[PDB]
Design a protein around this nucleic acid. Sequence first.
RNA 1: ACCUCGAUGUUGGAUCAGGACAUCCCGAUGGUGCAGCCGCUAUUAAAGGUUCGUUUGUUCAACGAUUAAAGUCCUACGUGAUCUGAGUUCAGACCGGAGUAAUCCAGGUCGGUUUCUAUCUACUUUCAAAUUCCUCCCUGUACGAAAGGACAAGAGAAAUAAGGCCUACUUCACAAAGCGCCUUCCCCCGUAAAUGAUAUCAUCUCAACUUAGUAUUAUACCCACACCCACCCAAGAACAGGGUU
RNA 2: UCUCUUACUUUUAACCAGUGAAAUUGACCUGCCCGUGAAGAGGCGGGCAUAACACAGCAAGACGAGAAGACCCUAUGGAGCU
RNA 3: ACUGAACUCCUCACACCCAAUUGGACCAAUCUAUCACCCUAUAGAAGAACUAAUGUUAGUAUAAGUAACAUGAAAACAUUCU
RNA 4: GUAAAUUUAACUGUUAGUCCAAAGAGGAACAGCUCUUUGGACACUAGGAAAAAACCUUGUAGAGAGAGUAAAAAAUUUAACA
RNA 5: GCUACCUAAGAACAGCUAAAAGAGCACACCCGUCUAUGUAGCAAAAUAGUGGGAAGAUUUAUAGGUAGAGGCGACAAACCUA
Lengths: 59, 306, 148, 152, 108
Amino acid sequence: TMMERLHLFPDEYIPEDILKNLVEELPQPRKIPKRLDEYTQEEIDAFPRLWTPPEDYRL
Amino acid sequence: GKSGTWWDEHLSEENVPFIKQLVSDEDKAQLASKLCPLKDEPWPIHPWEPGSFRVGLIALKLGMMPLWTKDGQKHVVTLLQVQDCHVLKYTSKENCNGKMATLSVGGKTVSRFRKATSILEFYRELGLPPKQTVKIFNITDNAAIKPGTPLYAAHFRPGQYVDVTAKTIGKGFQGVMKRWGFKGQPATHGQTKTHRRPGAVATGDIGRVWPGTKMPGKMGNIYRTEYGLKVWRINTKHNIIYVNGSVPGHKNCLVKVKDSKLPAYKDLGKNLPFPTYFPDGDEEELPEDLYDENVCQPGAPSITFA
Amino acid sequence: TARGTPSRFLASVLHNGLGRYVQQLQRLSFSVSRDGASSRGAREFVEREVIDFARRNPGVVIYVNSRPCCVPRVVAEYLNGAVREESIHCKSVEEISTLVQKLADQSGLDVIRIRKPFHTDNPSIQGQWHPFTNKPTTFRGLRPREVQ
Amino acid sequence: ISHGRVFRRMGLGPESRIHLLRNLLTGLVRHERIEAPWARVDEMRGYAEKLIDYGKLGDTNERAMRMADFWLTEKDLIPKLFQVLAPRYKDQTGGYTRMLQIPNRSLDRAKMAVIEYKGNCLPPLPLPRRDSHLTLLNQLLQGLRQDLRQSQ
Amino acid sequence: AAPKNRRTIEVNRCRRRNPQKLIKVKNNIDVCPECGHLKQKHVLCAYCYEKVCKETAEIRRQIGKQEGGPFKAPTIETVVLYTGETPSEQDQGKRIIERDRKRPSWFT
RNA sequence: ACCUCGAUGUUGGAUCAGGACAUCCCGAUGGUGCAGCCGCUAUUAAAGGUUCGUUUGUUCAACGAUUAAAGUCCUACGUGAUCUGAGUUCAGACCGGAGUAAUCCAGGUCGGUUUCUAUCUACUUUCAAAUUCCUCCCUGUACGAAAGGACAAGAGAAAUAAGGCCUACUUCACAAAGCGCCUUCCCCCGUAAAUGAUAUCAUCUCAACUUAGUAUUAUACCCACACCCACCCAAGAACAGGGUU
RNA sequence: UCUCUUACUUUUAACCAGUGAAAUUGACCUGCCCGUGAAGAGGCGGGCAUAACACAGCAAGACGAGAAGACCCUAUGGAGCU
RNA sequence: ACUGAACUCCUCACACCCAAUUGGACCAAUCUAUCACCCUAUAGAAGAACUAAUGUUAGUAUAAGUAACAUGAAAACAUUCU
RNA sequence: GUAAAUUUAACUGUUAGUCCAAAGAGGAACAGCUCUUUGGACACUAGGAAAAAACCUUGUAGAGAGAGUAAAAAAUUUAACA
RNA sequence: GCUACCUAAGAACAGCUAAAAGAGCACACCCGUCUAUGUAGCAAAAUAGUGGGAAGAUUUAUAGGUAGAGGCGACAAACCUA
Ligand SMILES: [Mg+2]
Ligand SMILES: [Mg+2]
Ligand SMILES: [Mg+2]
Ligand SMILES: [Mg+2]
Ligand SMILES: [Mg+2]
Ligand SMILES: [Mg+2]
Ligand SMILES: [Mg+2]
Ligand SMILES: [Mg+2]
Ligand SMILES: [Mg+2]
Ligand SMILES: [Mg+2]
Ligand SMILES: [Mg+2]
Ligand SMILES: [Mg+2]
Ligand SMILES: [Mg+2]
Ligand SMILES: [Mg+2]
Ligand SMILES: [Mg+2]
Ligand SMILES: [Mg+2]
Ligand SMILES: [Mg+2]
Ligand SMILES: [Mg+2]
Ligand SMILES: [Mg+2]
Ligand SMILES: [Mg+2]
Ligand SMILES: [Mg+2]
Ligand SMILES: [Mg+2]
Ligand SMILES: [Mg+2]
Ligand SMILES: [Mg+2]
Ligand SMILES: [Mg+2]
Ligand SMILES: [Mg+2]
Ligand SMILES: [Mg+2]
Ligand SMILES: [Mg+2]
Ligand SMILES: [Mg+2]
Ligand SMILES: [Mg+2]
Ligand SMILES: [Mg+2]
Ligand SMILES: [Mg+2]
Ligand SMILES: [Mg+2]
Ligand SMILES: [Mg+2]
Ligand SMILES: [Zn+2]
């Protein structure tokens, strides 16, 4: 019975009746570790440079 | 409490033949009304694409016959007669499983007095006699035909491989010897009432019998399919298909015929009619008998090797 | 065993303690024997302590029949129609006095399993909990994943 | 498996079955009406048809004479078969040995049938009559038939 | 093989009181149009069949009385007659058996 | 000597086999004292298969003829309410030996009753996606010094297994069968290689990554809610099912 | 006999009617896998499974039924024989 | 930090959780003496208490409506037939 | 610090024991093996270690819809080279 | 009154080959080799088939005799009322 009261969907699509039934979305437990490209360059400028590299290096 | 009843229970001595005659005439008129599918309002006819599948048909198993090839080899063939085959209903791609479209096709005509009332209403709306069997064919959307169209044997052409599904001959409750080919036990060397028994059924450690164990039981009355049967000949006058080898089930049984799904014959329908065979717009009637190019025709020069 | 016996909830008869307390015991009827070794405790109870009991509580009517019996008895009748019969057969006077005082102390309600030894008629003062208590509202009452 | 297997196993063997059917057929020829268990009556009806055909084959036919001599065990019904029964069905081709179901045998509750040669100076059996043409449904169908005839 | 345990009355009631073991109700039963004695469809009425059988037995007894002994089987047709009922012109060569009765109003 | 002596029946064999891989064959790789054909050894792989006989009760063993091979093991040394009873091991008897004798021998031999009507659990078509050998060509080529002698690709023939069928043949005969005929479709992973850092070379990568590399997001079956006395049936123990225009 | 089994008949069988036993039975609302445990679990632990209820089969388990093991040992228990 | 016993505390009460064995307080039925007189008391006594002995007898189940067991055919019930 | 001990009188029952820690002996520095000694537990309650005799926590009896606790949950991941 | 042996007085043994016969084939009759069924069975030892004998050391009816520390035994520890 508890599993009959459970509804799973693999994507963003949800049926309209269930959506009209929805209340009080729960918050996500994990924190989405925020990959490099979405970092609001102000934050990059805030973060310090830990080491000065040699000028004669190729990487 | 309402007693049961049949169609001719309260009918009179004079009214019984009248009812039979009238119902048979209405049946024949309905059957003849569908003779020209291309003039009523045909659904659009699409060209054949590589990854496309067309409809099959329902046939009747007539019997088996010998046949000989130009090299002198003998093959036994089975005759499948198309009695009254029509497309009954068509479901859209998304209305069944979203995987493939479906076409329902009906078999030989039966009596209207011994069918379910819902089935009777369905066939009344369709405007056709009731069919003994209905089989569903998975098709691509470009092969759909209008419901009520007739299907003819020339839908299949010689030099083609088909699949034949039917209910095999039922042998009732059979012992393990006949059912599973089990060897029995010796006949005279001392055995005590143990000549056809299955013997052991499991081991002692397991303490039970596995689900897949072979034991005596009802045998034979199940649907089975024969794959890759080559058609050798089409008789257009009587709508007969000559299919290589044997076909499951008894004679006078209804079989489901459709193109073989074996990988060796995936796209061989470039030369097969692809809404269906339509004998109205052909503008040239087919011969009474279409043969395969390797078949010794009945009128032959009595082939001599060289 | 509780599963093999009836049950009830804790209750009063007519809201006894709300206004005035009233004695729920109505009558005590005693069957005691003139002769007979089993009615000796009852005999001396009637001799000494029945008069003082009647004077102590005058809301109870006490009858003493004094008939030949093998088993002397006391029948307690309560304002709610309940009837209870007890045997005072071969009991001491102190035993009988304790019995009659206990009978006067109890109410007529059945002595069965009591089921949650408290009876409040107003269990909630700040409002009973429902799944929307302790739940904040949204602007325009918009449920999750809405548009307008 | 008994696919397409006529001739039920009746007695203690094929000869016993043949002799039981022969006794039933002799009784039928003698009495013109015989009651017996249903399946035996079915087999004996199948046999009585061909007995009447052999009788119609002619008195002087040697093969018919031998067949009658075997199948009639009283030797005084063979003249009956050849001069009463066969000449009774000269016009008709195969329509005799009317067979009906009678309620049940009392002791063992067996399914019971009655079988009679037509003609049969015996009193008639309570045959099941069809519904009269004056009933409401039959009158409606008759009106439909008349309307169809007029529309033709 | 012996039962390891006694079967309980609950199990026995479930086995022997389920619908497969119960008697089915039959709807083949209607009134006989003649004699109104509750026949069954597809089966002859017991009352009418008994009447016919009694008349046939009387006729056969008369046949045996007239025939003499065994092995007779006359080579002519037969006709049953009743009180009065002079023989008809078509039944000349037929054997005549007239026992004594008023012809029943079902045998014509 | 821990359960069982108010009974847990034993060796071999028959029948049916479930499972492990520590693989006998079929698949894929590394090394080789691997030129080729045969081999040896190691990694991975348990879907499939793993013969018939003479002697002996044999499991083993020897031998004969084959095969791609004739695997090891567990399953109450699987399985006697399915079977057998040839040994073992009761009562009869003989021989060799022991004993005064009765009697005895982890000596041999002739003979010697195998019960059970199934209450419970379990189970009784999982509807399907086969494997192997051989022949021909390649080729008498790759390879040697000679004998010898391959792969891969292709074509064709079978055998077995599974599933059906009766037109021939055969047992038979309004049927059922085999000795007859018809059909049978995807991989699997261990390594072999690009670019490239940690460690500006190089490095197949429990580095990020690119290939051989994934058959599957498989397709075939089957999927009609209530005419039903009764009759027939290629349907069937009963029930159910198909037909009755 | 077997490779290698098949067909039919009778009995049996299954259904209908009549009559009507016996062994057996602690109670049972009586599942599978792994583990545990008087050391081989339907009933215990962890999982999995799971509307109810007849009929026909089968014999893997219920250390299945029957016979207070006959084999072995013990008893200051017997008896036959020398 | 929390959970977690029949350990300990808390309100009230306390003789009220070991086999064999041993000590003790009561006690059902019955009969007898004397009471009592809708079923009791004080004493004396004894064939004095049964969820178990493959216990004895009787009843009734389970297996089970199961295994099993019957009557050659037609008819006029004279008779005839296989 | 504690409250038991000896003697006298009258008797039964127990005298076919297991595992754990420790010192040993035999065996294989095998055994859920056999034999001694010291102690514990079990053959009595409850909680824990998965179910669990013998390991750990815990004991003296009742009711409570109060409380504090006891024992009580396993952590580990690894080879370049001048 | 079964059975072992005996006593008295009886009975039976077709047909064929007859070598002459405790000879051969073979009925009745006596027995019980092997197989299958049965195993609470028809039966507390049977049925079907197949077998050994069947003019003799044969089979068999009747009455009588020998009895348990015994009888009887062409010794199987056989039989002496399952
Ligand atoms: Mg065989
Ligand atoms: Mg046997
Ligand atoms: Mg047999
Ligand atoms: Mg020990
Ligand atoms: Mg034992
Ligand atoms: Mg036991
Ligand atoms: Mg491996
Ligand atoms: Mg074994
Ligand atoms: Mg077994
Ligand atoms: Mg022998
Ligand atoms: Mg057996
Ligand atoms: Mg069970
Ligand atoms: Mg060469
Ligand atoms: Mg060269
Ligand atoms: Mg019955
Ligand atoms: Mg286990
Ligand atoms: Mg069953
Ligand atoms: Mg059990
Ligand atoms: Mg047992
Ligand atoms: Mg014993
Ligand atoms: Mg002793
Ligand atoms: Mg707590
Ligand atoms: Mg006594
Ligand atoms: Mg007593
Ligand atoms: Mg009792
Ligand atoms: Mg008892
Ligand atoms: Mg049963
Ligand atoms: Mg039976
Ligand atoms: Mg020990
Ligand atoms: Mg305490
Ligand atoms: Mg002689
Ligand atoms: Mg002789
Ligand atoms: Mg001797
Ligand atoms: Mg001896
Ligand atoms: Zn009537």
